[PDB]
Design an enzyme around this catalytic site. Structure first.
Site, PDB file in Angstrom:
ATOM      1  N   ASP A  32       0.862  -1.189   0.000  1.00 54.03           N
ATOM      2  CA  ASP A  32       0.000   0.000   0.000  1.00 54.03           C
ATOM      3  C   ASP A  32       0.904   1.246   0.000  1.00 54.03           C
ATOM      4  O   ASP A  32       2.009   1.212  -0.540  1.00 54.03           O
ATOM      5  CB  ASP A  32      -0.944  -0.056   1.231  1.00 54.03           C
ATOM      6  CG  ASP A  32      -2.286   0.630   0.982  1.00 54.03           C
ATOM      7  OD1 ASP A  32      -2.270   1.852   0.726  1.00 54.03           O
ATOM      8  OD2 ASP A  32      -3.332  -0.060   1.127  1.00 54.03           O
ATOM      9  N   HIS A  64      -3.903   5.704   3.486  1.00 53.66           N
ATOM     10  CA  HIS A  64      -4.556   4.450   3.232  1.00 53.66           C
ATOM     11  C   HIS A  64      -3.818   3.258   3.847  1.00 53.66           C
ATOM     12  O   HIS A  64      -4.446   2.429   4.499  1.00 53.66           O
ATOM     13  CB  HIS A  64      -4.644   4.236   1.728  1.00 53.66           C
ATOM     14  CG  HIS A  64      -5.523   5.191   1.005  1.00 53.66           C
ATOM     15  ND1 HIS A  64      -6.341   6.108   1.631  1.00 53.66           N
ATOM     16  CD2 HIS A  64      -5.784   5.286  -0.316  1.00 53.66           C
ATOM     17  CE1 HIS A  64      -7.015   6.787   0.717  1.00 53.66           C
ATOM     18  NE2 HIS A  64      -6.743   6.262  -0.463  1.00 53.66           N
ATOM     19  N   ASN A 155     -14.380  -0.776  -6.145  1.00 57.74           N
ATOM     20  CA  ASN A 155     -15.458   0.108  -5.710  1.00 57.74           C
ATOM     21  C   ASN A 155     -16.229   0.649  -6.925  1.00 57.74           C
ATOM     22  O   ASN A 155     -16.685   1.795  -6.903  1.00 57.74           O
ATOM     23  CB  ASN A 155     -14.885   1.268  -4.877  1.00 57.74           C
ATOM     24  CG  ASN A 155     -13.946   0.789  -3.824  1.00 57.74           C
ATOM     25  OD1 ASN A 155     -12.776   1.225  -3.794  1.00 57.74           O
ATOM     26  ND2 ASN A 155     -14.409  -0.092  -2.998  1.00 57.74           N
TER      27      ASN A 155
END
Ligand SMILES: [Ca+2]
Ligand SMILES: [Ca+2]
Length: 275
Positions: A32, A64, A155
């Site tokens: 990440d 994040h 998403n």
């Protein structure tokens, strides 16, 4: 005082903690934007950056990676939140910059590091619409090497009968994770398709943010670390189980929620999985 975010309870992580299993000695790579290793509610054991402009993996300009890390492993103490696997060994594998984006070369280099450093679990709360043969090859290599790879489904919501699962979640070797709320309803943004494997809490997820604070985010990137943490609990109880066994238990013991196109096998239940 410490709070236990609802999603930790919803996947039945506290049952494992009460049995004495908290993820000790299980190595979890957060692939990440870095992890703020100075956060008092996190313990980062190591890491590596593959972002050329950001050579420090222990700083996170996006937030994040730090948020995802806290869902996996926020410490059990007098402050903040509590992770799924609060004793897990956390590694900051920085492949995204402060904008939250990165090149596939950087991501691939991070996955290779995770293999070389004998990680048990990889969390990839990242995705995009285009495949790459190089990305599939390294993801598949990680799985073949024995690593559990959890990836955000995406998403992109729904679009009739079309799969909207992104990469690398779309690859069969990964566990593709979608998002539900505290009522076990699918979040409208959660990607759908045959490749979706399980759901976890992904709406209003409180976790650690850089600078020693906390806050809530939405996304399949918040659902994913519940599954990565659950894998770490399972391995702490069953240290001989292979990644394939861990995955089969997570999927097969999930609470069915409805049509698998939208929910996969349903909501993970780490108590049932780790029985
Ligand atoms: Ca805490
Ligand atoms: Ca998949």
């Amino acid at each position: 005082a410490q709070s236990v975010p609802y999603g930790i309870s919803q996947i039945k992580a506290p049952a494992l903690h009460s049995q004495g299993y908290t993820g000790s000695n299980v190595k979890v790579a957060v692939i990440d934007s870095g992890i703020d290793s100075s956060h008092p509610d996190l313990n980062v054991r190591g890491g590596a950056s593959f972002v050329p402009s950001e050579t420090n993996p222990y700083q996170d300009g996006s937030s994040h990676g730090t948020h995802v890390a806290g869902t996996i492993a926020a410490l059990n103490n007098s402050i903040g939140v509590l992770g799924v696997a609060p004793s897990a060994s956390l590694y900051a594998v920085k492949v995204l910059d402060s904008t939250g984006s990165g090149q596939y070369s950087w991501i691939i280099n991070g996955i290779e590091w995770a293999i070389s450093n004998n990680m048990d679990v990889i969390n990839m709360s990242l995705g995009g619409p285009t495949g790459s043969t190089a990305l599939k090859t390294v993801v598949d290599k990680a799985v073949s090497s024995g690593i559990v790879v959890a990836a955000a489904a995406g998403n992109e919501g729904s679009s009739g009968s079309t799969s909207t699962v992104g990469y690398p979640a779309k690859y069969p070797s990964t566990i593709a994770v979608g998002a539900v709320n505290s009522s076990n309803q699918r979040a409208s943004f959660s990607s759908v398709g045959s490749e979706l494997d399980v759901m976890a809490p992904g709406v209003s997820i409180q976790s650690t943010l850089p600078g020693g604070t906390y806050g809530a985010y939405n996304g399949t990137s918040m659902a994913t670390p519940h599954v990565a943490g659950a894998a770490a609990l399972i391995l702490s109880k069953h240290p001989t189980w292979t990644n394939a066994q861990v995955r089969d238990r997570l999927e097969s013991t999930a609470t069915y929620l409805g049509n698998s196109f939208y929910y996969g096998k349903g909501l993970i239940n780490v108590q049932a999985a780790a029985q």
